[model samples]
Structures are given as C-alpha cells and as structure tokens.
Target: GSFVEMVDNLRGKSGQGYYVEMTVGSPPQTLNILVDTGSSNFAVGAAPHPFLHRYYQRQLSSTYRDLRKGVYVPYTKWEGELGTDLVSIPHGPNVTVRANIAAITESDKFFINGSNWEGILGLAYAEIARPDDSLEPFFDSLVKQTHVPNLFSLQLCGSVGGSMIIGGIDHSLYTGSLWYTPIRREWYYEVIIVRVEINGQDLKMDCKEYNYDKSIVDSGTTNLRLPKKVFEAAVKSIKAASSTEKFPDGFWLGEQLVCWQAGTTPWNIFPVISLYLMGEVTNQSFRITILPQQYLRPVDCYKFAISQSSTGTVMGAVIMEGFYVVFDRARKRIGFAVSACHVHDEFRTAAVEGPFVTLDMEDCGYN
Candidate 1:
C-alpha cells in the first residue's frame, strides 16, 4: 500500500505535530497542513494574519467554488468561509477528491507564531465537523470518491518524523500482530482504557475514573492526557517508584521543564507506564507500555509528556509516536503495533502485551 512520509516539521523538538504536503484547487497550490484526528474541519489559511507565514489565495485558484457558508470551531475559536475545491494528496494516497474546504479567515489560539502548517487536515469522523455534522469530512469524501479501503494508519517517530498510510496498512511499518480495540465512538477515535500501570503496578483507581467522560487517541494533543484523578494518582505512583531527586511540583503539573547537565540522560530515573485498553473482544484487554524516552518531551529541555485533564483521557502523540496506529473506519476499530521506526531508532521506548482477561469488569468505558 502507498504511504505519506510526513516531514516532522519540528525536525527539531517538542514534536508539536506532523504536517502533510498536498495540493488544493485547480492549478494546484501546495500547502502544508497539520494532520489532526481531534478536529473534523479541513481548514486552510485564507486571510492575511501576522502569525501565518503564508495563506491559500482564494483568487489564485480557478477551481475554488464558494459555498457561501460560515464555519467556526468553538475550541480554537477559528472562523472560516466554507467552500469546495479539488484536493489531491500526491504524496499520500495519490488520489484526488472534491473536498469540503474551510477557508479560515479569522481565528484565536489556533495559529501560533512560526507554525509551519498553513492549514489543518482533520482526519476524523463527520460527526464532529464544525457548523454541523452533515458536512462530510475530507477523509470521508476521499474514501467515497476513491473506493479505497475505509481505513488509514499512522506511525509517529518521536522527534525524528513519521509516516501515514491511507486506505491500507503496511506490515513493514510494524512488528508482531496488530492488536485492535473496538472504537467506543466514531466522533474522536474514542476508545476504552481499562487500566493504567506505573512500573507494573495497577493504579487501582475506580475504573470509571480512567474514562471520566471519554478516551480518545488524538494525534494533535502533545501530551498523554489523563483524567484529573488518574493523572494525579499516576504521577504520585511514578514519583514514588522512580525518583527521589526533589523535583519541583511544577514539573509534575507539566508547567516546568527539566534540564540536566550537558552529557547525561534522565530516562534512567523514570519508570515505565503501561496502559491496558479494552480489546475487540469483550472479555479481554491489551497492554501498551511506554518508557520515559517516549513519554518525555525532548526539545533540548525535557518535560514529562503526561498531563492532567479534567475532561477525559487523551492518548496523544507522546503515546502514538511509539506505535503503528490503524484507524479502521470500516471495522470501527483501532489497531496498534510497535512502529518499525521506533525499532529503527534503537530507542525502542514502547512495549505491547495482551488479549489478557478484561480486568474481570463489566465495562471499563464511560457510558
């Protein structure tokens, strides 16, 4: 199957996100768009803004057709003009579709100064599309037009880079069998996390606490977001088991960075984290363990990739970068396997185990 080798624009640090190059409109205007599974709008920079280095000029594309619709993302406060145009992923699936495009003309908090992406390609379900769920998302449109398998896979290679395979899976990108979990909902790649273990010890919190509201595999989020209660306990467990080095409280809050001396590594001082997730089978679960190398953000200075979330659990890039993730829309399942890149780097910071008994619980997800 064909794949898109996305440039790790952050080829530097923090591994903020990955962007893909694609052409839009008739004459083919190339743009770098951030790939996010958390959003549903395929939006691009259309108006001039101080933060944006460049934008998609509406006048330059002869194929641009204004739908005369208004769209807005409540979270990011991004507002845009809705329209349709020919979108092609020459480097990706190598197919073209007349996709719904949101020409973002106004926004707050969406764009950061010096961001490399001019737009965002939301590869999520239509249920979360801004304006209304009726609007078909880009990936949905692509699948409908091209007749490819209704699935795509992602492999984020930590600070190095990553690859995305559309409509298919690449066996070479992963090792061992692919362990899949039934998606709890289609809205946000929502899944059920049954257990969290810090250094092989179960958090032992009420299972409901893990799925406070929902649990999603969001590529856009930088950290491994745990429910407020889960985060607190997880942190307390890690600190208790791994370190005695009086680190500031802010570090655990994800507010401060930890820098070590010039030639040393801090990973040795951190313990492994394992997440047991509900598998496709109702009576079983799967475990994916991550090392400090995968959970620690490296941007010259290091910070824990784990964060506290009041709402729900978010298995972000910090976790996804270590695995080959397959979103099987047709099957309504998400598969995970050790990413070959993670193996190639020799850092090998993740481990997968299970189909184990389902924690002997009725349902581990939020109902």
Candidate 2:
C-alpha cells in the first residue's frame, strides 16, 4: 500500500496514534507510538534476533525503510554509535526519511518496560534523520506530497493520555480563548516572552532587553528553565518572602525549611508561585500542590538552591500536569492555560483520557 493511503486509512479509523508493528526475523511485535509534531524521524527496535533474510525483507517492505546510510547524529553521552538509516516513502518523494534503525536487545529490556512502546516518532521542525543531513520535514513532506498544506496539531495530555491528529485539527481540543504569537522562522518554533513573574512580584528580567535568541517555548520540555542570571533573581525574590533558619549541617534531602522562631506570631506563607508567561498570568496556587516537598531543599544555611543549569530547570511533565498549552504553529505563537488537574488522583485519571501513544525513533538523514 502507498504510504499516504496507509496514513489515510489509519486516520479514518480514529483520531488516535497507531502502532507500526514490525518483525525483525524473530517474531512480530507491537509498539505504542505518539505522533509527535515536536520532532521528525521514525525508528523501531532491532532486538537480539539474528540478522536474517527476514529482517532484510521487512526493511525492504513499502512500510519500512532502512536509514542506516543516511545520517549520523552525535550524542555527548553515548559514543561509537552511528544513528539510524534514511528511508523514503512515495508521499515524501521530495523529502528523505532520516531514521535510526536499531536492533532491539535484552539490555533495552523491551519486555520488562511494558510492551506497549516499541519505537519513537519524532516530528520536530528540523530534519532529525541522520545527525548531519538537512532534508524536508516529515510533515512538510506529507504536505508537499498531498499537494495540500498539511496542518498537524497535537493535544498532548501529560505523560500518558493524549492524541496526535494529522492533516486536521480538533475543535474540541481548545476552549476558553486562543492566543496567537509570531514564530521566529528559525530552528524550532519559538515565541517572545513578555515577562516571567513568580507570584505578584516581577523577577525584573526584561524579555526585550535580554538576548532572547536562545529562549524557546517547547512543549517537549516539561519545566520552565531560566538563564543563570534570570533564575538567580527569581530565587532571590522567593527566599525574601520566607523566614530563614540555619540548618546545623548542610540540608540533607527531605529536610524542610522552618517558617518561624518560637514566638506566638502567626506565620504567613504564600499560597503558590505564579509564572506569568507572555502576558497570561496563570494562577499557580492550585498547581503548587503538585510540587514535591523535596524541591524545597536548602544548599546553604543562608540561601536555598532552587535553579539548575541551561536545560532550564526542566519545568517537566509534572509541572504541566493539568495545564492546556497551545502551540499555534502557523501564527508562530504559544499560549498556556490551567487545566483542572487532580494531582492526588491516580496517574491515569489525572491524564487527558483517550488512546495514547509515544514514538521512539531517531533521524536518518544526511547532514
């Protein structure tokens, strides 16, 4: 079957992510996949099974393409590994598939980690295929092939439950209001931050004054990361509001910061820290309950260590648990709104319930 036809068939069934079950000479296996718009690349696991003719047959099939020869991506952590091969589909005739085709192994422990996820589907703006190649984007390829401007929208519901809709948008996915921002037209989709405020007090970092060339609003990232200077300012303001007590020794994990001395005076504590993104002030009072108490650890007796390196304190999935973040790709704008998330409930319950899938592959394009 043609790639476009297969995707159409898949879309016809439901607006949910699908699994591309592939066999690698041993047996057929299934992998739950999340159709991601945040990246591009399609790859699956190649396990310990012998590299037999059957494996080659599967690779040659219309559904699967080997991208081993396409590109090479370098990772600072892992060495001596060439990424995936580059493959092409008829719909993506103008564009090549950059993929990381790997054999699944026991060390990856596919069986132990829940058999649902088999590979990763990256759908970012860049050609994530092989490390070096710059080819057409996966969705852009689809758009070119179909001769129609393909608009992909993702309604990611936390870590587990969410869906990826291709070639269309779901009106029900959005509510309240939709705010639009301009896109930077470089690298990944980026937006301008008006300011970032914690609680009512402004951290005093001007978005326009700072070189925002590096600031990015990524849904793939879970937490809000601040630059070194910006983070320090925010932390300083937060500490000023609270009382300080000296821990005889440096703070061991799990220790809490005491609020007051032995007096009859009642202590006033802030309800929740607020992050005003763009101009939208998301009242984080309810969401503050989701923060783990361990995060309050003090590195020194005089000051508390709250921020981390450039990865931007990873405002991770936990922090965005019940919030509706809007990524307006066309307009180049991003917006955030709070969802009524129940943090204390079961993980599944807290998520936006529906069919969910995650993709796990690398790019295999030429640099």
Candidate 3:
C-alpha cells in the first residue's frame, strides 16, 4: 500500500508552502491540502472570505456522519459543526486507502482558506490534533488500519515540485547515507539541535540563552525562525563578515521598518549556515546545511530564510529542502540524506546561465 503523491507548486511565490491532493467522501471529491507537520488537525473550509470556493463537501459522501445535530459538545476553533467521514488517500492503481477523519463544515482561521490548496493535512502526532485529540493520527491510522507501513518522507526542493512519500521510503529519491535522530517531543517534530555554527565558529553568546538549544523540525512553517536573542546574534555574525549590502526593510535587532524599498531577499552577502542535530549516542551529529546561494530567490530578489522570535528554533521547508527526510514513527526517529531536489547548489547556475535578464517598464507607463 505504498503511495507517492506529487504535490503541485503552482503559486511559485516567495513562500515555500507545499501541498498534496486527497479525495474525501463517497464517489470522491478531490481537494488540495497543505502538508503540515507542525499540526495534526485535518480540516477544510477554514478560510474567511469569498476567496474560498472549494471546501469539504461532507453530505456528498455516502460515509459521512454529522455530529453537530443533536448533541452540543465542546466547540472547536470556530462556530463550526463536527462530523466523521470516510477520508481516502491516493494509492496504487485505482484503489485508494480509506480511513475515518474528523470533518468540520464551517470555516476557521489559521488555515489555507484560499490557494492551490483549500485545507491543511497535519502530519504531527494526535497530541496536538483537533477533535477528541485521540491517537487517531492520519499516518498512524494508515499504518494500523491498512497495508501501509509506518513511514513517510519529504523532499521539497527544486522545480521538481517536491513529493510526499507515504507508507514507505523511496531509495531512488535520495542519495548518501540517511542520518537518523530520535523525536525529543511529539507536540511538534521536535529534535535536538546541539548547536548552530557559522563556517566553523560556535555561537558562544547564544548558547547562554533559554531557547537556544531547542529546535523543532516543522514543514508547516515557512522559514527558519529562532529565539529573539539567538537570531540577533546570528544575524549580527552574518553582517560582521558579509559583503556591502543592506536590506531596507525587515526585522533585525529591533530596527523595525526602517527606510529602503524591499523586494524579498536581502542575502547575497551572508555565508553558509548549518544546524548540527545530535544523534542518539554521545558526540554524533547530523547536518542540515544552508549555503548563501540556497537562501536567495531565482531572480535574487529576496532571501528564503530569516531570523524571528519563537519559543524555539523551527526548520521549515527552506532548511529541509534538498534533503530526503524520513519521519519514522515506528522507531520514533527521523532520518535525512542528500536529495536530488536540493537548491542550495542550484544557485551556481547563475554563473553558468549568466545574470538574470530583466526588461521593460516604460511600456507599463510612468518613469
């Protein structure tokens, strides 16, 4: 029952948010949903405006069960109704893997109410999921209730559009030895980030802070956000040895909303950044490296990752890109290996392909 679904990258915008397809209800009403590991609530119609047209059509499914009719219970995030319906995942051939999912009709905030995807599919444990918050995690149910294995992997780099491999791992998708680490916490895909290094020097100032060591590997977050103090030190370190370039707008050291027109990236002058993940034993570490080129956009208009305030560090798709990651629930450990989908090295094409060419503006008027 191994399934590999290719998520489309239509927006192609500044954000690296990825999505996957799944059909809900009977007769199948397929929908696009964000593959989020930071959360575990599978819900649709969570948007707030007319920008939302495609949502979960529960009554359309023959296996739908509405739970908001007679019994009034603890309300969810919004003034919505709850129900259980047959949710299916795309599998081999025309056959699909079916399972029960807690469904809601009324829309809520904190979800993709508008985009190529209409909802969010949380890959984290059930401890943080909505509804009863039971042990009915989507992936767990797929393993225990079907022939699918208790494994999932992500490779969200390159124009290949990225992929979400469920049920099992695809060796062909990744290269090199896969490094594995235990899940320190289940609320989020938490891991042990022993420390962060620039070139070769350790951040001695940051190690003294509170949220310096704790890091969460979340696919839902868009960028790598660290503790306020920790990030200030990192950003300062980068500028200390960087090229002559200054970003006009962005959050850095409390200099909020200063002068200068901004595009998206402010990174061409920074060096490579790496996160050293600790292994199960002593003195062993796994690496998630990010080169300066990998942090810039194709047009070099904006940077991909940045520093921000958070309880702990979160390595979003920007950092996870190019590495084939295995989220193994059976062993309670995660794995990483070199991927063909990496973009950090892709920036080298700038020289080979020559500088990006841009033209026109007078035709659009004014100057």
Candidate 4:
C-alpha cells in the first residue's frame, strides 16, 4: 500500500498525542494500530514460526530491514533486555530499503494474551539504539536521514470517524482557531503558562508561570499535572464548583481535582478544557465523565480522592482526540487545532491561531 494509505490506517484511533497500530500473529493475522508520541521505537508481536505468514512476515521482509547488528535497546525498567535487528528489502539489486524492527519478547507487557492488543510502538522522544551508553531514538534517526524538516502531524478522529497522519501536515485537519505555544526543545514542547480561566474568572494561581516537557504529553497517560502549590490552588478553584465524593481507591470524586494543573483551569466543569499556548488557547483538555461517575461508586458522600500524588502529570489521549497536533522537530515547535471528528461539535472551539512558538527553557526552572 502507499505510505500515506498505510499510515492513515495504522495510526491510533483514540485522541492520544501520537498514533500506533496493533498486529496479531495467530491464524488470521490482524493489523490494528493507534497513535503514540511518548517514545520512538516500533515493534510488533512475533510468534516463532517454521517459515513466516504473509502479514506477519511483511515486517521482516526486505522492504523493512532489521538493525540487530548495528543497534541495541535496553529497557531500564525491565530485566533480560533484547535487541532489535534491521530488516531490509531489495528495492533493486544494489539499492535496498531498510526498516529497524524487533520481535516481541515475552518480557514486555501486551494485550494479545487477554487484552485486544499484541504489541506497542513507543513514539516518545528517546533514543532508538546505542553503540556505547548513548541512545538513538528511532524517529530521530528517520528525521536525521530524511532531512526533510523532521516533523509530523496527527489528526485523531473520534471512535467512529477517527484517523491520523504522520510525516506530513494536513491543513484541512484544522477547524476553528489555533493556540500556538513555544516548544521547549528538550524532549517535548515545554509550554509557558500565562493564566488559567475558570467560568470566565481567573483563579488566584494564575500568576505562577509553569513549563513542561514533551515526555509529559502522552496518549497513554490519563491527566494533566501541576506543581504542588499550583495544584493546591487549582483544587481550591475546582472545589468551588464540585460536590464532595469518594472512590474505592481512597480518592475523592469531584470536578475539583486534576492530575496536574498547568496554571490552566482546575475543574472539569466544561466538557472540554482550553489550554492557553502562547497567546492563543486550544480547548484540548478532555475528561472521562463516565469513568469518574461509574468507577467512583460514591461512599459517605465521598466518591474519590480529592488529591493525588505528584509524579509528573500526563496529557493523555483522553483530551487529544479530534484535534490536529503538529510536532516540528527542526524548528522545535508544536501546534494544535480542532479536528472534524464527530465529537468535534462537543467541544467549545479550536485553538487560537498564531505563529508557532517554542518553549522558554529559562522559565522551565529545570536547574
């Protein structure tokens, strides 16, 4: 299939930051995928077979080269690490196309056993392979080799009409306004906060400016994060609009609590939340209303925990669906706009449009 055609289908369906797909290796191999941007290595589940199946074998075909001899990936979190190999296909006699690929080992977590997925594609901004102790991010390598302005855009459609694109930007993907924020250039775009507005009122915590790296922008993650002081202040604002409730996890259930408050709005009052990136704000914040209401089986008027520990917040896919996200690696900039997904109508507006911006490293306070 064409590159665009393949990517269009392989992208993730949910509104995660990036897109990924899943492939099954059993009798009838299936290729399912979703988007991801937290890591930059892609691998699929591989079963030991006598020869190879058409679909499953395609990954290792000459078209896709395995770089096992040239690179290694060490999972610090996991033991007994395995390395990936380069798979290549003969574009011609002398010239060949290569793709870095790996087989899924039993060590990694996957869903094929019980869940719907078989493997994952780490799309984060990390190294892909290393000769010594250094890491080589897979996507970064692609960008370096292509030299075509290392950047990618994602257009996540809703469950019903969801779609995603990579390596290119789709102007049609944008709808209303766009909020441009400066990119941090570290790993992810570390955004600066101007102020957060709730119900048209700026909260007391608005004065404090905050910065975050792209590692925090994940599709797998669940909520946003804020510093302790900022979080406390945000909770105060959210609590004003929420009712007391508790959950089985010993957490409280109220619109007042968030994983991290970026000096953005604190409460989940709006079905959609707006993030002010640069001078413009994109209404990209999302909430799982049903999960909170259903999972929190309220008790004693307490449905969930009002506060959660800080381990760095994740801007998961829940809020990214139906939005077009642009990651400009060369310029070190990221952009966001509303999408045409069926759920688009549910949102208030697209991001406020302006020139793409980069994050202010000095303000990040990483020292």
Candidate 5:
C-alpha cells in the first residue's frame, strides 16, 4: 500500500502552539490537535475545562475501545485512560490508522489559557511512550499500517501556522537542499549541539555547555530552552550585540513581556543566533541560524523565545519555523532546510549553514 501525499496546512497562535485538524472515533469527531514531536502519547481532552472549548466524547464514538490502562505525561502532568480508535486526517491525503489514544481525565498546565487545541498528537518514537515502550506511538502505527516512508517533515510559519507532511517530504515547502544530523538517541529526536553563536561571533563557553544534559528538537515546546549556563551566555551575547539600551533583566529572562506600539517591529534592535549541530562525523557540524525575529518573537507583544532550563537544550517552534524539519526515523536522522514559508518582506526568517569542520576546545571531560 502506498502512503498518499498529505499536507496539513495550519498554524496556531504563538501562545497556542502549532497543530493540525484530525478526526477520531467511528462517526468522526473533528478536533485541532497540537502536533508534538518531542513526546510519544496521543492524548485528547475527555473532561471539561474552562480553556477547552470541546473534547473527545468517547461515549459518542461507537468504534472507541477502552483499554483499561492508565497513562500520564510527565511534561504536562496530565493523567488519562488509554483507549483505541480510528484516527484520520480530514484535510490531508486519505489515510487512517486504528491507533492508541489517551483520553485525558485530569490535567494542569497542559491546557493553557486561550489555547485552541483540544488534544496533542505526539510524532516521536515509542521508546518514550507512556505506560510502557510496548505501547506504539501514533506515527509508528501510521507508518506500519500504511506502509509509507518512515518519515515526516514540519514547516512552522510562526503565528501564521505550518504544515506536517507525513509518509514523505513535500519538496515545495522548503528551499535549498536538506542537511541532516544523526539522531543521538531514540527516546526523542535527540541531537548534539556543538555551539551557539550571536551574529557571527561564537558564544565563548565550553563547547560541552551546549549539550549539558542533551539536545533535542521539540515542536511541543514554544521557546528555545537552554541550560542555565548557556542561557546566561546567550543572553549576555545578545545584549552585547544588540542595542545597549538599558532594558530590564526580566525582559531577557522572559519574565516580562516586551511590547511596543502595534504594527512596529523590534527586529532591528536584536541579534541573530546560530546553532551548530553535530553531524554524523564527530568532527563535522551543520549550522542552523535564526534571525532576531525568531528569538524575540512577536505574539501581539514580543516575548523573548529563549528560556533557561535545568533539562537539556530544546530547540522549539521559534527555531524550527525558519527551517523545514524532517524526522527520518528509518535512517535515524533529522533533516533541515530553508522553509519556503519563513520569508517575510523578502527576508528569510531562518537559515542553514555549514558542514564546516568542528572547532577545537578545551576538554571538560564531557561528551
């Protein structure tokens, strides 16, 4: 069976996250679901919450089968029941998979204020699936049932939305050729980040600081989260490279919302950031660069998209929007290309550079 070409063209608000509309259950209940590459569970709203406009009413779907299993998402602290149902993309190519779905009964920050999505569709591998690894992820099951290529690509266009191309790549969605990096692990779309640069100047820190714990590309996360040390270094560099105007420390720390008059831009006052990703060869690396508009994102009012995290680095939508990202599970690699949708006023929002030789640094006894 051939996996038909399908395109999910939709973009959610900056605060809402990126998502696509899909149908689940027998008679087909439609809902907009957050497409999260960093996680492995496919969960939807089952109980009522003020932030949720609608939910997946299991009692309404004849094909819904209760699995009598419980599941939880550590990221959001959401607890739910496991079930099986027919999942289909209503707006894409004809495809359907009878896959596992989580009916969330309890939650917390998972459903944030003003969110339009009713569920989440995790596109990562099953290694991190809830309950156990034995529970197959939605994308894994989709590929197995459809016999499509074991890959999918994402193109987020900021608040304008993005597309998730499953089973194959949509060549027109991106410009230039695709550059790839090896998947460091199977739990997430993990990769090693060699270094981060402000403008063309490198962040002067131990190279291993870039990957203190681990590095992964995640669509579920809204910002580019970095380790404490790296975050501090990046903020310092950005401040130094940009205007010396005495902005509050809270602004750069993402504690305060930096807003200007409507229809104005702060891009001119910010600096571009470049991330060097380790390639298949340890000594070689690929560079993915983002303009000031990416990091200092404007969601009506601009909010610094860079955040400090105790966990490893997470390159989220703010960084991903500039590139067409491919999750090639079969080859165990992630690919990046200039996204066709990233161009604004003739200026490309994202960039990809290098295959440049890795830079030498002092040994910190870190990988």
Candidate 6:
C-alpha cells in the first residue's frame, strides 16, 4: 500500500474540500482534486477556462492520452474518458509513477461539490470502478499497479489540513489498538455498524427501516448520516452553546453552538457521541468516537451528522476526523485509532499503548 502521500482540505463548513495535488499532462501541470474514498471515478474539469484551472492548468487533449473513449458514466452521468498521464503525488515519494488520470469533461450530479478543486482522487477498492461500472481506483493503482502496500490511513488532524498515509499505516498516528471491521462489499468501502449512541445513551434503533443502524465509512461526505429518528434525538440534545436558546424548524440553529472551550481537544464541556459497529464475528463489535471538538471547532461551527431517512447510514468525515482510520485490504478490515496528533509525531507503539478508549464502551476517540 505504498500509502505514499496523504492530503486533506481546508477546515470549514465547505464542501468536502480535502484533496491531493497531482502533476499531469505532457508538460506536467500540477492539479489538485478532491481526495474522496467514497467513489471511484477520478474525473476533473476538462474545460481549461473553468475556475479549476486556477489551481493549475487543465490537461490539453493533445497532451492527454485517452485509455478509454470519452463517454458519460451511468453512475454520475459525468462525461469523460479513461485517460492516463505522468501523475505523481507531490512530495509523496521520488518514485516515478504514471497515473491513470481522467480527461474529465463535465457532469450533472458530480462528486466534488465545490468549484475550486480540480477532479476527484477516488480511494475505494477498484472492484467498484468504471468500464461496465469498474475501473482501477487511486489506492488500487498504487497497490496493484505500483506494488505499494495494500493499506492506507487518514488523519484529518485539525482545521489547517491533514495527511493521507499510503502503503502502510503509521504506528504513531493513534493510540491503543487498531479496531477493524470488514469491508461489507467492494462498492463504497461500507461496513455493518451495529448500534449508535449520543452523549452516553443508546439511540432508538429497534426499527428495521435501514438495517437499524448500519453505516459506511465515507470521506466524500462532509457530515455523519444517521437514521432520521436517531439523528433528530442527537440534534435535540445539542444545547445552545451555554445559553437558554430555543430550538425550532427541526434543525440546530446558528444562534446556538455546540459550545466548547479553547485548548480542550478532549472537550469536557460537551458530551461525546459514540457509534458501535460490527467486529470480527456477527455479534462482535467495535466503537467509533466523536469528540466534541470534531463536531464543532474552536470557533463553534455546528458540523453535525445529517438525518438520513435512507438505509445504511454513513460514518462520514466527522467520525473519521476524530480517529486515525485504516483501510486494510489485505485483511478485509477497517481500523480506527484516536487522532488529533500532528504529523511526524514520534511512534511510541509500546509506550502509552492507548489514550485507548472507544465510543459506547467507556471512552471516546479518531481521523
């Protein structure tokens, strides 16, 4: 999983703004695309006149080589062609790597929601890509094509930006053990999360509407997606940042905040939310923690998980941002460790062993 380079977005309530810069085209222009592990298409804007060119020049048709003829995908209806280029992870590894790039033309329901970034850097398993709904994804290319490690990790430490470790998981990123869950299918890096809780109480999930509390691990989505009933209860619990403010409109209003004090990474002021997912056995389980700060930064923005009336709830970036998450293809498991530690932090594998706590059990913690 050479996990050569890791990239994240600028912190804000913006579109899932994480990205990695890749040098493409014959002349090698640098391009930044949304680093999404949710989908598989690495489609960027084909129009050089588009604002995405402001990040870097778009690839010219002459310089770009089409691996597959141009066409619109049934999945996204995005018009594009399977393409290739001299793509390299900026400051990743000196190894020369030819990337399977996309000469992205355009699309209706597209992946990267924001306009500033270029294309998408899909990071899921390639079993769910293009060409009859299949193509090699970014991580798969590094592993199968380049022979890197068959694993990768993400640490969205905080507001500034974070790193995406490819090839191998940095032992230093999180504390305690790496609790893993199997990839349900190869489609969207999904898993079977068993239960969920807020503040410390279990959520009402007896209803079989959407596998009860099933969820997926997604970097593409900005917030968590839980069942409507569960989500509503959690939101109702969020008080107005140390005030007697009222709640209406079935939403958490801006007049209030998910308040937290400065310098309190482990927010004692607010109660932490816990998500319990399937473990090795059918009954076995693991936990995901959402620290107060992860849901709300120091400035007190309400970055919450949305209510989903749909099945298979999403454990999106919010859950990931709190822990150092690992996607281990070799083992068919996903691991989570408490993050919030900075880059190059020394690996004390045997020392503290754990700031070692997880949600729903007794403690909270991750990306």
TM-scores, all models, native as reference: 0.93, 0.55, 0.78, 0.62, 0.91, 0.76
128-203 per-residue lDDT for model 6 (tens digits): 6665455566666666567676877777665246677766776666667777777767777777655566665766
Each candidate: RMSD to true structure? 2.3, 12.1, 11.1, 8.7, 2.9, 6.4
Which tens-of-lDDT digit does each residue in 191-303 have in candidate 5? 87877788888888777777776788899888899889989888878888665555777888787877677766556567778888877665778898888767777754777
CA lDDT for candidate 6:
0.59
**In terms of TM-score, which candidate is strongest?**
1
In model 3, which runs have C-alpha deviations exceeding 4 angstroms? 1-13, 46-49, 69-79, 91-102, 108-114, 158-160, 205-214, 249-269, 297-299, 346-367
When 2 and 6 are scored with TM-score, the better candidate is: 6
lDDT of 3 by residue, 1-24 (tens): 324443322222346477777777
Q: Give the TM-score comparing model 5 with the true structure, all chains together.
A: 0.91
lDDT of 1 by residue, 110-166 (tens): 887776678899988888888889999999998889977899888888635677787
Model 4: per-residue Cα lDDT over 188-243, one tens digit each: 43444444444445544433333322224555443454555555655555445554
lDDT of 2: 0.37
- The lDDT for every candidate, in the order shown, is 0.81, 0.37, 0.60, 0.41, 0.81, 0.59
Q: Is candidate 3 or candidate 6 better by lDDT?
A: 3
Local lDDT at 217 for model 5: 89
